[PDB]
Design a protein around this ligand. Structure first.
Ligand SMILES: [Cu+2]
Ligand SMILES: [Cu+2]
Ligand SMILES: [Cu+2]
Ligand SMILES: [Cu+2]
Ligand SMILES: [Cu+2]
Ligand SMILES: [Cu+2]
Ligand SMILES: [Cu+2]
Length: 457
């Protein structure tokens, strides 16, 4: 097997600046070449390292032939750092953002957020990581050696035509169910191997698929110790035998590498509608872990962090959000699960009856105050991972039930699938009308066909 590629861990240079170049290039999958996009390279991107309480300047150079944006998924930052329309970077253009990090240590990520083409630009290969560190986590003695016992694992699927090129098409069908592919990639490679020393191995898991849910496990069913979610550490490690991960979500897990016994990270079959699984739906391997005689120094503490109690729900504003899809998309989405009109579909999917409008923010949210957002997909049976910018929130109810323990800490994504979710959000930064925050489904094709709203703080 090829070895697991390891994204560069970028820090500031001498002038407190980090340089990101958006460019097209060539990658090779299974023998055949493919035109890919990357940040500082042909595919994916580096891991930008940030320190809490400190500022960096990021210089972005769009060397593509079309417009793009750079959204910092999971960063609590003013709306300006994404920008709105000012956040567009034309081909050959450049754009500078200063990032002030004041949130707990976490794994976030960044990717394009272009109006209507987010799904395509991610499909082409643009995604990078953000590694946030603070005082608290560095005292914990977790495995921390980048690319050795602390490794990023970006899992994506891609659909390749027979010429080996990426086959993306935002047609009427992919707008209903999302863009799916038959090739599973880990950090760009097909089923790579990572050599890991004995002791604890730390995996930063990102589901970077356009539309596919993942369910991570090990081949020999050894447990995964969840230590962090989207927003950072849990109060204590949460042991699981399998780990569902929605599109755009991150979890950090420790896995025990206790012998010379090599094992696989796998993703398990996922129920499509609430539906059964025949044995010829099989687990697919993601990455092979190969132990080595070196013993690593990382540890797993009994206590990881301190999460504040949920504030009382009395006195908090309630904002309702109703996700809906065009019934034709939903219906034709089920016909495919087993297998008319003029109908523009670029604004088919809606929130509160409105397809997204770049100039029309749906409301303003309070700054520095917890609000109670209730997001419902009741009229619909498809999975919608709902993402909100500018915050790390607490899930009160996920799809009708209180969250699982490993999903009860800091999150920026919540499952909405035929039911109602309730989150507890606080926004610490301004986002005026020209630089408005977004809230949207992170099945990218749904977001490109209207399922998004802007809001100001
Ligand atoms: Cu995102
Ligand atoms: Cu501005
Ligand atoms: Cu801040
Ligand atoms: Cu399969
Ligand atoms: Cu539009
Ligand atoms: Cu959706
Ligand atoms: Cu977004």
């Amino acid at each position: 097997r090829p070895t697991l590629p390891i994204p560069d861990l970028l820090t500031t240079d001498a002038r407190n600046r980090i340089q990101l170049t958006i460019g097209a290039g060539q990658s090779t999958f299974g023998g055949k070449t493919a035109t890919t996009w990357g940040y500082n390279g042909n595919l994916l991107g580096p891991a930008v390292k940030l320190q809490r309480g400190k500022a960096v300047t990021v210089d972005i150079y769009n060397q593509l032939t079309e417009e793009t944006t750079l959204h910092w998924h999971g960063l609590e930052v003013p709306g300006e750092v994404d920008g709105g329309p000012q956040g567009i970077i034309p081909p050959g253009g450049k754009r500078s953002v200063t990032l002030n990090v004041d949130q707990p240590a976490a794994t976030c990520w960044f990717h394009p957020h272009q109006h209507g083409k987010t799904g395509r630009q991610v499909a082409m290969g643009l995604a990078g990581l953000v590694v946030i560190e603070d005082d608290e986590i560095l005292k914990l003695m977790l495995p921390k050696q980048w690319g050795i016992d602390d490794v990023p694992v970006i899992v994506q699927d891609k659909k390749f035509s027979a010429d080996g090129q990426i086959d993306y098409q935002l047609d009427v069908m992919t707008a209903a169910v999302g863009w799916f592919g038959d090739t599973l990639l880990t950090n760009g490679a097909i089923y790579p191997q990572h050599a890991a020393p004995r002791g604890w191995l730390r995996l930063r898991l990102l589901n970077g698929c356009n539309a596919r849910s993942l369910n991570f496990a090990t081949s020999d069913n050894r447990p995964l110790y969840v230590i962090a979610s989207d927003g950072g550490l849990l109060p204590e490690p949460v042991k699981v035998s399998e780990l569902p991960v929605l599109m755009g979500e991150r979890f950090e897990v420790l896995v025990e590498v206790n012998d010379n016994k090599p094992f696989d990270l796998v993703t398990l079959p996922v129920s499509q509608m609430k539906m059964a699984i025949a044995p010829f739906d099989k687990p697919h391997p993601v990455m092979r872990i190969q132990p080595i005689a070196i013993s690593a120094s990382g540890a797993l503490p009994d206590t990881l962090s301190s999460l504040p109690a949920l504030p009382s729900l009395e006195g908090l504003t309630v904002r309702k959000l109703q996700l809906s899809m065009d019934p034709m998309l939903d219906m034709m989405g089920m016909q495919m699960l087993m297998e008319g009109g003029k109908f523009d579909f670029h604004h088919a999917n809606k929130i509160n009856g409105q397809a997204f409008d770049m100039n029309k923010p749906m409301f303003a949210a309070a700054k520095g105050q917890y609000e109670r957002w209730v997001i419902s997909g009741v009229g619909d049976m498809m999975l919608h991972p709902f993402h909100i910018h500018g915050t790390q929130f607490r899930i009160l109810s996920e799809n009708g039930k209180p969250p699982a323990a490993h999903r009860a800490g800091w999150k920026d994504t919540v499952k909405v699938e035929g039911n109602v979710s309730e989150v507890l959000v606080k926004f610490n930064h301004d986002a005026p009308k020209e630089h408005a925050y977004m809230a949207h489904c992170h099945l990218l094709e749904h977001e490109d066909t209207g399922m998004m709203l802007g809001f100001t703080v």
